[PDB]
Design a binder for these strands. Sequence first.
DNA 1: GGGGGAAGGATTCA
DNA 2: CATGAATCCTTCCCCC
Length: 341
Amino acid sequence: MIVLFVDFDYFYAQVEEVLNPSLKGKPVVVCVFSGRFEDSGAVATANYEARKFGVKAGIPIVEAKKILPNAVYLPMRKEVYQQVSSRIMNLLREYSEKIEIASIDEAYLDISDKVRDYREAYNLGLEIKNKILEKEKITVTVGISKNKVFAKIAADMAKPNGIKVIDDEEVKRLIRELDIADVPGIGNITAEKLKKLGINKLVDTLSIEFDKLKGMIGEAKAKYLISLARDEYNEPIRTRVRKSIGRIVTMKRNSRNLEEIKPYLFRAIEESYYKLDKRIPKAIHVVAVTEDLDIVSRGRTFPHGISKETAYSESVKLLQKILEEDERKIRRIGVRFSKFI
DNA sequence: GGGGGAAGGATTCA
DNA sequence: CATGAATCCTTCCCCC
Ligand SMILES: [Ca+2]
Ligand SMILES: [Ca+2]
Ligand SMILES: [Ca+2]
C-alpha cells in the first residue's frame, strides 16, 4: 500500500500571509484572545519565523510577547481558514478517490493504485505541492510510506515545505530508533506511562506481556503500538464521519452563578445550532472547564430530535446538575450536540 | 455471562 | 498563563 500524507505548513499563520502578503518573512502569531485581561489567551499557531525563537502553539500570548514583542499578533479567523482548507482538500481529491481528511490541515491519500514504486509516488508528491502552491499560495509538507502512521512521521521529519519518503528499510530502523513519543497518537501522558514500562522505542513494545501493556495504556493503544512495531499496521484510508457539533467559550471571569453563566451558555447554543445546519441532534451535553482546567459534563439523549427551545431548557438543567455536583468554579462553558438523525 | 446503550471522563493535537 | 471533536475507557444499568 502507498499512502501519501499532506500537512499544510503552519496553516493559520500562512493563510494570514496569503491574505496579507506583506507579512511574508515576519514572525506571525495567530492567537485566541480570551478577553479576561489585556492579551489574555493562547497562541493557536505561529509561523517558522516566530517558532524558531520558542513562540509556539499553547503558550500564553503574554509569554509570546516577552520573547518577540515586535512580532505580528493576529486574532484567529477559523471560518476563513476552513474555507481555504476546503478548497485545498477538493484539489487533493483529484489525485485520489481514496482520501481521508484528518483535520483542517491534514489529509491522507491512498495512491496505491495511481502509482507504483516510491519514485512515482514521490513525483505525485512534488506535483501536488506545486499544484497547491500555485492555486492557493500555500506551502505544504508531504510524507510518503507504507501506511498512514509512517507517512505522517515522514511529514513530521520533513516539515516545513518538504517531501520525505520512508521506505520499508527505514521503517525497520525507525521501529528501533524512533522515540516512541514521536509516534502519532502518543502524547506526553502516554509517553510517560510507556517510559515506566521500559518502553522508549517501538521495538520495546514486543518485549512486554500484552496484558501488562494493555493494563497500562489500554487495549486499543496496545494493539496499535504492537502492530506498528511488528510492521503490520495497515489501517485503510477513510475520512471519519462528523459525529458531533458544539462550542465552548471562556468567560471573562470564573463563576458559579447560574445567571452569570447562562449568557455564555446560550451563546454557545446559538453558534452550535447555526453550525449544525440541517442536522438534528438527539443528544446534548453541557461541558464545563473548571478553574483547574478540569473538564466536567452532563448530558442527555432524547428519543427524538432536539429543538432549540428544548436545548435552552435542557442545557440549564444540565448546568445546574454540574454546579450541584461539583464545587469548583467554572472557567469555560459550552455545549455539544450529537446522535444526528 | 454478556449484548448493547447511555453517561462521564481521559487523551490527542493546531 | 491556561484556547473542536474523534477515539477510546470505565462504570452502570436493563435483562435475556
Ligand atoms: Ca498538522
Ligand atoms: Ca499545520
Ligand atoms: Ca508526541
